[PDB]
Amino acid sequence: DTNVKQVKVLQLINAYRFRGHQHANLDPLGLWQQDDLDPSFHDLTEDFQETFNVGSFAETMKLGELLEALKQTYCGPIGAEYMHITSTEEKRWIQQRIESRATFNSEEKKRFLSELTAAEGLERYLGAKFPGRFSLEGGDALIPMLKEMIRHAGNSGTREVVLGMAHRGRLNVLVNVLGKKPQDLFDEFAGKHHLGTGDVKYHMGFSSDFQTDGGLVHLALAFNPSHLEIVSPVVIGSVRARLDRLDEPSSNKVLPITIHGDAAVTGQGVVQETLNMSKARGYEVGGTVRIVINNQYCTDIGKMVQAPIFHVNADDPEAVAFVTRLALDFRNTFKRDVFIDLVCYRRHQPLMYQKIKKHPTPRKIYADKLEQEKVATLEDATEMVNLYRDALDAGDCVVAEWRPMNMHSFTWSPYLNHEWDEEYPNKVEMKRLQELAKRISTVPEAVEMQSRVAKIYGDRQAMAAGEKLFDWGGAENLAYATLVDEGIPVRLSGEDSGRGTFFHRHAVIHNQSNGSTYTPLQHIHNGQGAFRVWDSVLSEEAVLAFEYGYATAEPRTLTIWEAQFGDFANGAQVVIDQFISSGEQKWGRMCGLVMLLPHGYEGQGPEHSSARLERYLQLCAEQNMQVCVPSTPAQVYHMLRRQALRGMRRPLVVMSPKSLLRHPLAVSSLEELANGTFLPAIGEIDELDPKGVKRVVMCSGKVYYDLLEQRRKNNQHDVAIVRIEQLYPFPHKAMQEVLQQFAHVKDFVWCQEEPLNQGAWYCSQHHFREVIPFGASLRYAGRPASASPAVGHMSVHQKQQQDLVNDALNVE
Amino acid sequence: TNVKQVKVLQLINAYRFRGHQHANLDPLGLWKVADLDPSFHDLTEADFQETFNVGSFASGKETMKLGELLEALKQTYCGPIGAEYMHITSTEEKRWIQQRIESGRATFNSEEKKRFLSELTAAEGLERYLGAKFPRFSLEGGDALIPMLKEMIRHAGNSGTREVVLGMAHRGRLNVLVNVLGKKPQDLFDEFAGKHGTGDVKYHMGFSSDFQTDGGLVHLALAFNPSHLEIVSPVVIGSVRARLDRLDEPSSNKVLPITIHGDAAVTGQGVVQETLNMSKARGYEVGGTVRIVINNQYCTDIGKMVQAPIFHVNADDPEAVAFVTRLALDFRNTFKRDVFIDLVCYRRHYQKIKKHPTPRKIYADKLEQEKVATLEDATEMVNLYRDALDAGDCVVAEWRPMNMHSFTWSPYLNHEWDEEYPNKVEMKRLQELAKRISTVPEAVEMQSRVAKIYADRQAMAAGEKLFDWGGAENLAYATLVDEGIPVRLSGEDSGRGTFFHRHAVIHNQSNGSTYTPLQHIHNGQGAFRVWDSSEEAVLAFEYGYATAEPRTLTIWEAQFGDFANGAQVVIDQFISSGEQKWGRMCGLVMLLPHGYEGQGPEHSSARLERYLQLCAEQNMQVCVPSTPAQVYHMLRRQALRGMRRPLVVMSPKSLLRHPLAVSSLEELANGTFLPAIGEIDELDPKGVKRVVMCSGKVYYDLLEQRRKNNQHDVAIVRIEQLYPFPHKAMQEVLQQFAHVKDFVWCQEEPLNQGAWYCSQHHFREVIPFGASLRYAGRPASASPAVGYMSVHQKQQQDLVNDALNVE
Ligand SMILES: Nc1ncnc2c1ncn2[C@@H]1O[C@H](COP(=O)(O)O)[C@@H](O)[C@H]1O
Numbered sequence A: 001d002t003n004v005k006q007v008k009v010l011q012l013i014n015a016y017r018f019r020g021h022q023h024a025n026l027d028p029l030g031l032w033q034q035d036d037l038d039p040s041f042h043d044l045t046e047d048f049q050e051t052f053n054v055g056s057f058a059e060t061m062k063l064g065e066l067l068e069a070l071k072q073t074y075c076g077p078i079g080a081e082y083m084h085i086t087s088t089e090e091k092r093w094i095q096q097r098i099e100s101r102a103t104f105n106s107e108e109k110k111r112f113l114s115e116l117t118a119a120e121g122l123e124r125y126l127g128a129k130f131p132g133r134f135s136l137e138g139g140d141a142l143i144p145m146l147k148e149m150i151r152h153a154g155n156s157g158t159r160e161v162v163l164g165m166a167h168r169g170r171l172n173v174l175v176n177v178l179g180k181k182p183q184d185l186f187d188e189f190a191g192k193h194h195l196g197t198g199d200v201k202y203h204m205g206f207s208s209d210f211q212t213d214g215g216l217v218h219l220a221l222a223f224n225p226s227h228l229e230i231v232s233p234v235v236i237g238s239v240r241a242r243l244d245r246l247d248e249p250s251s252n253k254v255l256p257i258t259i260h261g262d263a264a265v266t267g268q269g270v271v272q273e274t275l276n277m278s279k280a281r282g283y284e285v286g287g288t289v290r291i292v293i294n295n296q297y298c299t300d301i302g303k304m305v306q307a308p309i310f311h312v313n314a315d316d317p318e319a320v321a322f323v324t325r326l327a328l329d330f331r332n333t334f335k336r337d338v339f340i341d342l343v344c345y346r347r348h349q350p351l352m353y354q355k356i357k358k359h360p361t362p363r364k365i366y367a368d369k370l371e372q373e374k375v376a377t378l379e380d381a382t383e384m385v386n387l388y389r390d391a392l393d394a395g396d397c398v399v400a401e402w403r404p405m406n407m408h409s410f411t412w413s414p415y416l417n418h419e420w421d422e423e424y425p426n427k428v429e430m431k432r433l434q435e436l437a438k439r440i441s442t443v444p445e446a447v448e449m450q451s452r453v454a455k456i457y458g459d460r461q462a463m464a465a466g467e468k469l470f471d472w473g474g475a476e477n478l479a480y481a482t483l484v485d486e487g488i489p490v491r492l493s494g495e496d497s498g499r500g501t502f503f504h505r506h507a508v509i510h511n512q513s514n515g516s517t518y519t520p521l522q523h524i525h526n527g528q529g530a531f532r533v534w535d536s537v538l539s540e541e542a543v544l545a546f547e548y549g550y551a552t553a554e555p556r557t558l559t560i561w562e563a564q565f566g567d568f569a570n571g572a573q574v575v576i577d578q579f580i581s582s583g584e585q586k587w588g589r590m591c592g593l594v595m596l597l598p599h600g601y602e603g604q605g606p607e608h609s610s611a612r613l614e615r616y617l618q619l620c621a622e623q624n625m626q627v628c629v630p631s632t633p634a635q636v637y638h639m640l641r642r643q644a645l646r647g648m649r650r651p652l653v654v655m656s657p658k659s660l661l662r663h664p665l666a667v668s669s670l671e672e673l674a675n676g677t678f679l680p681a682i683g684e685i686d687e688l689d690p691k692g693v694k695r696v697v698m699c700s701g702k703v704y705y706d707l708l709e710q711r712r713k714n715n716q717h718d719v720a721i722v723r724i725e726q727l728y729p730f731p732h733k734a735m736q737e738v739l740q741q742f743a744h745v746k747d748f749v750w751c752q753e754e755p756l757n758q759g760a761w762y763c764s765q766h767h768f769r770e771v772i773p774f775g776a777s778l779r780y781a782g783r784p785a786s787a788s789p790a791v792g793h794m795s796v797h798q799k800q801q802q803d804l805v806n807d808a809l810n811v812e
Numbered sequence B: 001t002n003v004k005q006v007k008v009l010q011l012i013n014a015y016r017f018r019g020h021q022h023a024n025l026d027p028l029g030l031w032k033v034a035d036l037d038p039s040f041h042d043l044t045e046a047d048f049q050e051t052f053n054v055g056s057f058a059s060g061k062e063t064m065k066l067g068e069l070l071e072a073l074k075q076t077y078c079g080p081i082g083a084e085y086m087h088i089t090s091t092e093e094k095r096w097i098q099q100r101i102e103s104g105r106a107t108f109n110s111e112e113k114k115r116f117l118s119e120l121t122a123a124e125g126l127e128r129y130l131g132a133k134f135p136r137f138s139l140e141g142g143d144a145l146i147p148m149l150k151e152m153i154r155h156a157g158n159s160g161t162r163e164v165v166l167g168m169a170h171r172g173r174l175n176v177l178v179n180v181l182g183k184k185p186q187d188l189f190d191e192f193a194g195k196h197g198t199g200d201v202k203y204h205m206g207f208s209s210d211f212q213t214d215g216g217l218v219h220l221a222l223a224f225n226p227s228h229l230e231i232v233s234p235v236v237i238g239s240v241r242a243r244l245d246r247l248d249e250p251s252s253n254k255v256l257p258i259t260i261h262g263d264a265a266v267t268g269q270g271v272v273q274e275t276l277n278m279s280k281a282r283g284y285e286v287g288g289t290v291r292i293v294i295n296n297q298y299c300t301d302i303g304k305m306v307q308a309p310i311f312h313v314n315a316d317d318p319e320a321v322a323f324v325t326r327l328a329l330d331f332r333n334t335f336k337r338d339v340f341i342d343l344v345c346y347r348r349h350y351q352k353i354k355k356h357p358t359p360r361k362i363y364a365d366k367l368e369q370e371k372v373a374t375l376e377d378a379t380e381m382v383n384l385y386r387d388a389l390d391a392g393d394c395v396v397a398e399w400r401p402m403n404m405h406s407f408t409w410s411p412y413l414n415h416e417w418d419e420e421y422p423n424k425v426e427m428k429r430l431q432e433l434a435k436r437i438s439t440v441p442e443a444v445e446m447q448s449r450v451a452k453i454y455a456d457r458q459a460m461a462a463g464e465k466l467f468d469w470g471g472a473e474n475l476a477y478a479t480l481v482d483e484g485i486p487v488r489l490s491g492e493d494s495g496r497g498t499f500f501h502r503h504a505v506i507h508n509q510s511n512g513s514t515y516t517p518l519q520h521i522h523n524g525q526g527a528f529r530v531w532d533s534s535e536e537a538v539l540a541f542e543y544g545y546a547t548a549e550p551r552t553l554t555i556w557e558a559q560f561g562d563f564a565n566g567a568q569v570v571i572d573q574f575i576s577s578g579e580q581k582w583g584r585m586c587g588l589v590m591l592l593p594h595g596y597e598g599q600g601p602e603h604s605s606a607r608l609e610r611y612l613q614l615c616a617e618q619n620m621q622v623c624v625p626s627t628p629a630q631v632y633h634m635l636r637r638q639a640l641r642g643m644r645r646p647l648v649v650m651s652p653k654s655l656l657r658h659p660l661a662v663s664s665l666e667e668l669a670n671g672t673f674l675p676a677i678g679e680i681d682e683l684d685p686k687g688v689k690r691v692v693m694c695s696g697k698v699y700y701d702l703l704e705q706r707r708k709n710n711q712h713d714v715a716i717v718r719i720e721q722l723y724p725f726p727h728k729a730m731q732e733v734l735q736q737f738a739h740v741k742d743f744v745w746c747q748e749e750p751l752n753q754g755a756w757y758c759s760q761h762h763f764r765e766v767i768p769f770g771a772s773l774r775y776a777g778r779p780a781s782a783s784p785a786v787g788y789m790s791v792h793q794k795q796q797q798d799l800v801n802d803a804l805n806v807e
């Protein structure tokens, strides 16, 4: 009897919660094919005036009334699928919100109508004027949705919003949300304009302020390439930077919004990578609001994590508004990714095309409704449509709440139009240097050090005191000290980067007592730059994108990304190709990201030998990047400081050393640190009688030391060996300084560890030629060309190293 | 009591769903759910003695006392196996799983038990033997991987599986190679001693071998891979589709893909998603692959993206592992979908780990207790195995040397690029074919624009009209499948063509159906298949497919070349370098649409220069065909030569419709692929002051300008094949200009892109001793192309003009 039935009703409430969404009126076309637990009878009833307890269903209700309420709640225009989430209080939170809506009022409804009108009217104006649809029609409700999202952010103390989307709807969002001048857009179509090489109109970002009741929000819409889905981790990178510059930096204060298409989101693996990474300390941003523009489920990746998915019918702006707040409230409340599945169509399987043509547009559907509610007449709707058309004709901003940015919002202005060779405060006063050298070498006794580490630290105290030369790690960390000391923050990010893949850095010290850590660079003085090191793992495409976004938002911070080995960075080729190396020219976007790519031929094989130097060199042009191969601790130290101290903001690609990290000749003095500078080139270091010199060898990086040791060994005085430490921009001045004593030499050799089709030969040939004397010939010494970067077998490597070295040194 | 009956059913359902959160899974035990408690469901201790219907609980003792149902539920769902399956939507699947798990579980006989012990002993033994001799990425702590795979292989044999394809990574690799695949311990030992193309590290080696099971011989193929994690997965799956495509009897139990993943890598690499999402598609699907996660410490939740049953199992219990292995196989065989096994284990190379006994120890003990095998038994296993290692010969009893017919590559192994191949086709037959594939049954009702394209093609067959690019290209496929050579075309919109040039597939506007004329040439033809595509997994898959099947012409087409960098890892680590690293040949064709036409930085450049820079030691071909004839001969060459190396094509966009880019029947029937093309206009050699060389669409710009100018003193020559560089061909086309001293290389692409920097050194080789060589083309740039059309247009006109401007 009735005991048993009460239990059955609970089971029925439950089934609606779980799966009600699958019978929801989501599709605006009504051609969706809904494929159980949902009819009473499967749960054995008939009965509808029997009164029941209704469990947690936001006390007592006649049955048939409950079934009403459940169908409303879970089977109308919103499909909440949300009971996979394990947090009890989150579900209950949601239930509370949806299981109890107030009505919007005449002015909010009208306003919805107004934004649908703009959505449509812009799409139509552009159709008529420029018959060449990435039109938003009809996912028109995106405009009302974004505008509401932003208003709600305002009223919840959000200060900035960062957006990334793609092409569909792009022009609409630009004009009707971000506030770009229609006239500016119309001009773009006519070919009226930038002073780089540019990109197409659908990749355009935009920055503005937007006035809400709750205050002034900053809007930032990303630039992006045609490659789908990769702007995402760029955005959230962007937002971590912006959070990192607030004084108490709570997530709700910067909101990331990403807009996706159904196919891209299931089909692009950077989505997985991004979800995985947003979990990680040093990368989290308190969750992203993800909008899926659902045309042709797809949101099913959002269960690899576990996030609420709100599906909604684009044809109901009111339901759309409601879900918008719901999703936003949820994310600001619980610091978690949320998904809004915006279910719509492309006005622009010819069986549904016919469906679409006979279907009224969202503006139309809504104005008809506001008319059968006596909230706006035809004459009202019609005049919204006339007003908007007129405004387009006038060409001015059409977003009433757009405000021009304040001076203080222009964070990049100091950093534009600088050249690589500008002067910068290279020197640091010896007293202060040693003071810092000593502080970062000195670990409170509280911290129990592992044995090998404690040694390394004893060494660095001895470097500080002049009693021992700096190695790479000692000098590198000293660079960071000198930067944070004067207020410049550092962010270092990479696989195992706190200690170092090669055990060289030990910026972070693992306590053997507490199991905690201590990071010396964080304890210099009150009010220093922050210093933060973050250990990635994998997700390498998403990570570099993130750091690119970060460096892009924040030019005051020295932002470093370190690949385990350079060989792996091709996992991020799209970032390197579409953003880092080309973003300035395409988009005007500066970036001082530093990339540490361990690189060097040491016999460990094809994926542990080559950063593919040559690929970065071919990408170089128009001063776009710097490519450096530092050979000394002093060099790395000056190199990093230059990047921070010196105005320009352009990617620094570094061929980082592995074995040089402990080479006994790779070693530097305090005098070289304090009074030295970054040297684009380094001349011959030994005494040779220049009149006796028959050959100059030029080279970069570790192979230098092999040549040096071999030439000393041979007792040889007739061949000089010069380093080129910066291959791009190519340092002509420096080159003529180190070459002047050799004006009379006719035999010049470029020597490289790397194979002929690789390293610098093919790309930097023409520079070498510009720089050697008018007489001189120029020839190659190095490994033969090869399909694989590096041979498999150590004995073969060793023979090749010896052979290329002897060949360089051999004048016979 | 009616009420309690409903609630006992909910209790069962709770265990089905969530039992696994309380299963004994962590070997270490160093690892609370209200649903799992009878009290949660309003049942009491005193209820335990009462008896209930147990609905579908598959036991099937069809009513039980509750106390006892509870013992069973726990013994089923909270023992050494954790089953997550109830999130799957398919009733029959869930019922199927219930039938096999809720039953029972698992009685193994003494012969099998001792075989497990034996296999664990091998796993432990090899790893200690290596550790002692060469002080490795040891399997230790997941020794059960070994009996698992051997059982997987045995069970597949009894299932009529004929091939197994595995990819995995570094942990456990030496062990699998030796104790599963059959590599001789001596070979491994030599390798550690550096007694040995350019090669690669031992942890990347793959291996082929045959394996005698009770059910039949089974071929095993373990993939080569680079240091990069997880990208070998889609490669294996491609391999499998190829193996399935060569069966008369294309049943999917017949070939089994297995991928072995780490838990970090499985959630941190995007290819997993990409591969999971591609395995749904026609035809990249292969009837499901079984995925083993080697879990050291959830990482498996990515399989709910695709709604895969997931079996967790305690690696210290080899009988658990075996049962789950069979179950997984049977499900994949049965329902043709992916399945995950989560092997819960630990890395032996810290306090709790060190006084934890090895899995050999634990199971030897347990067989003692069971009087199935004694200290002395177990011990002699250890000693027999160490002795075997000392002798250095195969330690896999079931190993067998492969049959001649398993050597599918031996014909293709040692070939040069300029080898003679059967270029000519007899005119009668070309025309017969051209007519066949352009004639469509009248039942098929074509969209008007496609109908017009097809009439043009009938005109082309007849000689009325010169071939355009799509005409010739389709005709190439037709000539190959004609003679029994299969074709696989894979790419975005590749059926019709991104640029609407192909129309290999016709969409019948009446039936909603399709018709593909290349599939209807004659019975016994090569299969022709075009598939419409997750770029990185797709390319990886096509590569696997080509390394498996050298008889099929396998073509991948990017939507635009600019996007292929999405797949840089496949290019860098497999396609370009596999032959030298691994001895792995591959005739994969890549169509990369490429051309400066003013559509911006991502619709302009395939990055020719990046492929050029990867070229060395004859690894690849890079071609820029300028004619329908040329594309036709290029594709036929690739298929008809014995060489199997990647062919990277700069594929045209505009040229697809350029009025001058057309070709005659005579050029198709009696021509051949020309690595270089000479001056084509009547031009007096002694009038010529300058020779311009170039490739691809620029040619036509230069030609059309030169003709406008009525210029006779500048010859223009195409290099169609840029690598390997065609020295003989270039001499024939430059001979009549031996006296010219002014040579220009001219390219659309910016100065630091395209061919200039990489091919320079070839160019200087091949022009006359007197002669100078200078560049005409776009200036260097950081973006591949400008954002604005007008600027594009000026740049095009200027480089063309510069190149033609003599004195
Ligand atoms: N990485 C960058 N390079 C150059 N300008 C930028 C960069 N980031 C932001 N800006 C400009 O600075 C202002 C504030 O940017 P945002 O805070 O990102 O909206 C806007 O004018 C941006 O165009």
Ligand SMILES: Nc1ncnc2c1ncn2[C@@H]1O[C@H](COP(=O)(O)O)[C@@H](O)[C@H]1O
Binding pocket: B207, B208, B209, B220, B221, B222, B406, B407, B408, B409, B546, B547, B548, B583, B584, B585, B586
């Ligand atoms: N792509 C390839 N290149 C060269 N040899 C291959 C290739 N694929 C398979 N083989 C060899 O052919 C035999 C059978 O290959 P499989 O069927 O992959 O086990 C083994 O000897 C393989 O080494």
